Design a protein around this ligand. Structure first.
Ligand SMILES: Cc1c(Oc2ccccc2OCCn2ccc(=O)[nH]c2=O)cc(F)c2ccc(C#N)cc12
Ligand SMILES: [Mg+2]
Lengths: 549, 402
């Protein structure tokens, strides 16, 4: 059976075929293998070969507890064969599927064995059925199951086979995925069944069998962790385990399932649990759960208590995305066309840095949504965002990094995204001027943070187990604590300057968080920088006060 | 043209396997039209799954008609085999000409074609992408001008004979033509070259003035009244510039702040401090001493957002050894944004880099990776693509190059 053209296949340059000897099998397995191989030889799938075939690949037979199955171990051959154009890893997203009136699922029986294998390559597929004394030599004529090239070559072959039928039927949408075809149309159910039958016979003309009965799979369709209904889609039931102790592996599977749930369950928070997963040790060890992780998991359970579904896509309707804050660095979003009918949902809880602010994270969320939208629908959505033009404009204008803001409408739905504080751009008249400095011994880890002001005020606070950077931040914090509502602050630390000028409203470190609370409580704060050890004036006094001691 | 030039890859190196970026339905449709027509003209052919290689493709505008741009950066890195005039930057006027179409006259080495494989992506992974490979010399591949070089010299020979003082340098798909003539004479000569190329079957469907390019001298503020904060800023900046210019001093300036002063206190510039500042203004006029270009080292370009449509940039090979500096500006018109301006800036800097040294620099872009990857094609008009990475570096670098 060679109506299907073969794909030319070569081994990796400098490599020869596999010569893995056949492991000894029991008599029953030998019998089963003999019968199965005679049936396959009868169908032209394999052929008995001469004695001078130097190559061999181990063969096995089993029946997972009635039927027997032949499994071949092509690991060596696979390692010795060329690379192919990568088979589709990515699956279509249900929220991207366009609602059809009629839908059919076709399972291709014995997919690989229906496609011929390149002639010059068949000798490398040689396997041996063991004789009782010591054997029968065989080789494949079709795509072997478990071989490296089978999925891609079957894919290609199926595409080429489908091309004419698709050419004569442009009103029929055909998805191709592994050994499955998913066929949709808007024709009348009867003539849709007719078109399906035509496709079936056409495929049968190329040696591809389809379900003969009324097609084995009916709605809803269980597929890759999804439930596909006629008018809606959702995820398969997510069961979160309840354990006293948790290993790294358990937490990985947990955050896995929560990630999976987040695409349709709005409000899922995975962050604290992944914070637990920051211990990138072996997957064995027990990781103690943090209170925040407990609360997070509990809230997740509360969310997963209610059934949720998504709708399919309509190209004529606009694409709309909404974003809401979920608390400390966590965000959630909904993508829909009909106001309460979600195409899908999602989350965003990345800091990508020790410190950040709400507007930055919002912009990043918008970026993620944009990318995802391009991937799923091939277009960017309109944005309804809980932030005002003045806020965002001020931010992206003052932001030293280039950013892309879409067209969006302000939706007033608390909590609104806002600038909790804004540093002054000019020094403040009448406000006290704190010259600050922090120092630390890089050996004893002891340190001190101090200030000297223009009003003649001086102070030094001792610190244990710290570093110079943290002492500089500590110095800024000290200046905030002991000052009025308006304050000028001068530092020689480029580090601290960089952290404060970025104007964060959330942080990993509690010190920076305290500083943030202080900045929020203030009315006007101006931060200035000077080069250290230059005898500037004010800075030299605090240095001499705090650097040596 | 039957005789193809045998192309090889560097020893112990396999072809490119780069991910194809997701595209909007618009761009995909455009690419399908373009590639259908290219296939009808024998320029490309469909390939089977036995070809594992891949090279990204994008749809741009360069006109209203869509253009196809291929990112051959990886293939260019993995394939090499084999000059730049220093006088090009001296010329008064330099005009760039697109001569890429000529490459489609020459067949590509049959054994090498599989390495030019590319994919037109599908939406939502509905179908596997449409895969092609090139039958002819593709635009954007560094092998194409190398192979076409003899033909190009052949066609250009009469014109160069006629115009000995005119400089012609080729970089990838572009021809750089420099003269010291008057602008009208220049453009006339340019048009003569164009018509020559056209009548010799070389289709050519942007003029610079490197005579005005320079390394920007550091500028110090000028104020009627100085506050403590102003003098602090000045001392910090001069201290920064002292790493580059040795003779800079700040003693007399910093002396004016002795004690613990309020930031907003007005400080009079004494005679000594003003002398020091004047001297420092004088030393910043002269160019740096020991900075020379190394052809064996990578060119690095850093960029800073200055606001109000202004962007500063530096090209260097080693830190604090700027080969060139500059400031790009764009009239808002309310139609502009950060990404547009940054893209334009990158293209201008790259052009200048090509004109001066004959290669593209490695960019450090002040932007989030995914944002750039999303929107960079929207304003990209060039046929080449430089290397780039993504950084922060905000804190003092802005106001110093400002
Ligand atoms: C059955 C079907 C599809 O169907 C479609 C096939 C072709 C074109 C458009 C389709 O669907 C549009 C959306 N939709 C969906 C299900 C339904 O019942 N009705 C619909 O309208 C599309 C898919 F990705 C499928 C993936 C896996 C499986 C399985 N097992 C079946 C699928
Ligand atoms: Mg210090």
């Amino acid at each position: 059976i060679s109506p299907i053209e073969t794909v030319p296949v070569k081994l990796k340059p400098g490599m020869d075929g596999p010569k893995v000897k056949q492991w000894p099998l029991t008599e029953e397995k030998i019998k089963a293998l003999v019968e199965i191989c005679t049936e396959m030889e009868k169908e032209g799938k394999i052929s008995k070969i001469g004695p001078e075939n130097p190559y061999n690949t181990p063969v096995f037979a089993i029946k997972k507890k009635t039927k027997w199955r032949k499994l071949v171990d092509f690991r060596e051959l696979n390692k010795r064969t060329q690379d192919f154009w990568e088979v589709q890893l990515g699956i279509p997203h249900p929220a991207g599927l366009k609602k059809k009136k009629s839908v059919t699922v076709l399972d291709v029986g014995d997919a690989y064995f229906s496609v011929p294998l390149d002639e010059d390559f068949r000798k490398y597929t040689a396997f041996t059925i063991p004789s009782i004394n010591n054997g029968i030599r065989y080789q494949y004529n079709v795509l072997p199951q478990g071989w490296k090239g089978s999925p891609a070559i079957f894919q290609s072959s199926m595409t080429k086979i489908l091309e004419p039928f698709a050419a004569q039927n442009p009103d029929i949408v055909i998805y191709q995925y592994m050994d499955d075809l998913y066929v949709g149309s808007d024709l009348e159910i009867g003539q849709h069944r007719t078109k399906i039958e035509e496709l079936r016979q056409h495929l049968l003309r190329w040696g591809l069998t389809t379900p003969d009965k009324k097609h084995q799979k009916e709605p809803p369709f269980l597929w890759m962790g999804y439930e596909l209904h006629p008018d809606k889609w959702t995820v398969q039931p997510i069961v979160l385990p309840e354990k006293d102790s948790w290993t790294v592996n358990d937490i990985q599977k947990l955050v896995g399932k929560l990630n999976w749930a987040s695409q349709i369950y709005p409000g899922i928070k995975v962050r604290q649990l992944s914070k637990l997963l920051r211990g990138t040790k072996a997957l064995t060890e027990v990781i103690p759960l943090t209170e925040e992780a407990e609360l997070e998991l509990a809230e997740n359970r509360e969310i997963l208590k209610e059934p949720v579904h998504g709708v399919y896509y309509d190209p004529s309707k606009d694409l709309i995305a909404e974003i809401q804050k979920q608390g400390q660095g966590q965000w959630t979003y909904q993508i829909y066309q009909e106001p309460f009918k979600n195409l899908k949902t999602g989350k965003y809880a990345r800091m990508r840095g020790a410190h950040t602010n709400d507007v930055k994270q919002l912009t990043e969320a918008v970026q993620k949504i944009t990318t995802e939208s391009i991937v799923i629908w091939g277009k960017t959505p309109k944005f309804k965002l809980p932030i005002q033009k003045e806020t965002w404009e001020t931010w992206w204008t003052e932001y030293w990094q280039a950013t892309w803001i879409p067209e969006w409408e302000f939706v007033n739905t608390p909590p609104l995204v806002k600038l909790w504080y804004q540093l002054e751009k000019e020094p403040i008249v009448g406000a006290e001027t704190f010259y600050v400095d922090g120092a630390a011994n890089r050996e004893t880890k002891l340190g001190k943070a101090g200030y000297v002001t223009n009003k003649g005020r001086q102070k030094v606070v001792p610190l244990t187990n710290t570093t110079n950077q943290k002492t500089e931040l500590q110095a800024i914090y000290l200046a905030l604590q002991d000052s009025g509502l308006e304050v000028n602050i001068v530092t020689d630390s480029q580090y601290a300057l960089g952290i404060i000028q970025a104007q964060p409203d959330k942080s990993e470190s509690e010190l920076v968080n305290q500083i943030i609370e202080q900045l929020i409580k203030k009315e006007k704060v101006y931060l200035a920088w000077v080069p250290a050890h230059k005898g500037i004036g004010g800075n030299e006094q605090v240095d001499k006060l705090v650097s040596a001691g | 043209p039957i005789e193809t030039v045998p192309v090889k890859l560097k020893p112990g190196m396999d072809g490119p396997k780069v991910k194809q970026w997701p595209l909007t339905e618009e761009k995909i449709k455009a690419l399908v039209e373009i590639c259908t027509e290219m296939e009808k003209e024998g320029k490309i052919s469909k390939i089977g799954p036995e070809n594992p290689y891949n090279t990204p493709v994008f749809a741009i505008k360069k006109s209203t008609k869509w253009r196809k741009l291929v990112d051959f950066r990886e293939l260019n890195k993995r394939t090499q085999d084999f000059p730049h005039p220093a006088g090009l930057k001296k010329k008064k006027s330099v005009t760039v000409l697109d001569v890429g179409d000529a490459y489609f006259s020459v067949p590509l080495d049959e054994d090498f074609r599989k390495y030019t494989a590319f994919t037109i992506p599908s939406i939502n992974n509905e179908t596997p992408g449409i895969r092609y490979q090139y039958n002819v010399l593709p635009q954007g591949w560094k092998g194409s001008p190398a192979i076409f070089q003899s033909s190009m010299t052949k066609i250009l020979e009469p014109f160069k004979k006629q115009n000995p003082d005119i400089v012609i340098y080729q970089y990838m798909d572009d021809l750089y033509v420099g003269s010291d003539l008057e602008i009208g004479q220049h453009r006339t000569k340019i048009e003569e070259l164009r018509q020559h190329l056209l009548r010799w079957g070389l289709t050519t469907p942007y003029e610079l003035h490197p005579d005005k390019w320079t390394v920007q001298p550091i500028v110090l503020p000028e104020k009627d009244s100085w506050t403590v904060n102003d003098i602090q800023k000045l001392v910090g900046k001069l201290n920064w510039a002292s790493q580059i210019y040795p003779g800079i001093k700040v003693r007399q300036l910093s002396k004016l702040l002795r004690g613990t002063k309020a930031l907003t206190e007005v400080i009079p510039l004494t005679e000594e401090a003003e002398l020091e500042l004047a001297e420092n203004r004088e030393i910043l006029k002269e160019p740096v001493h020991g900075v020379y270009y190394d052809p064996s080292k990578d060119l690095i370009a850093e960029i800073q957002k200055q606001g109000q449509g202004q962007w500063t940039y530096q090209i260097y090979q080693e830190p604090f050894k700027n080969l060139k500096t500059g400031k790009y500006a764009r009239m808002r018109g309310a139609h502009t944004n950060d990404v547009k301006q940054l893209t334009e800036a990158v293209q201008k800097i790259t052009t200048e880099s090509i004109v001066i040294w004959g290669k593209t620099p490695k960019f450090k872009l002040p932007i989030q990776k995914e944002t750039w990857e999303t929107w960079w094609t929207e304003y990209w008009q060039a046929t080449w693509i430089p290397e780039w990475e993504f950084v922060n570096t905000p804190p003092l670098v802005k106001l110093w190059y400002q």
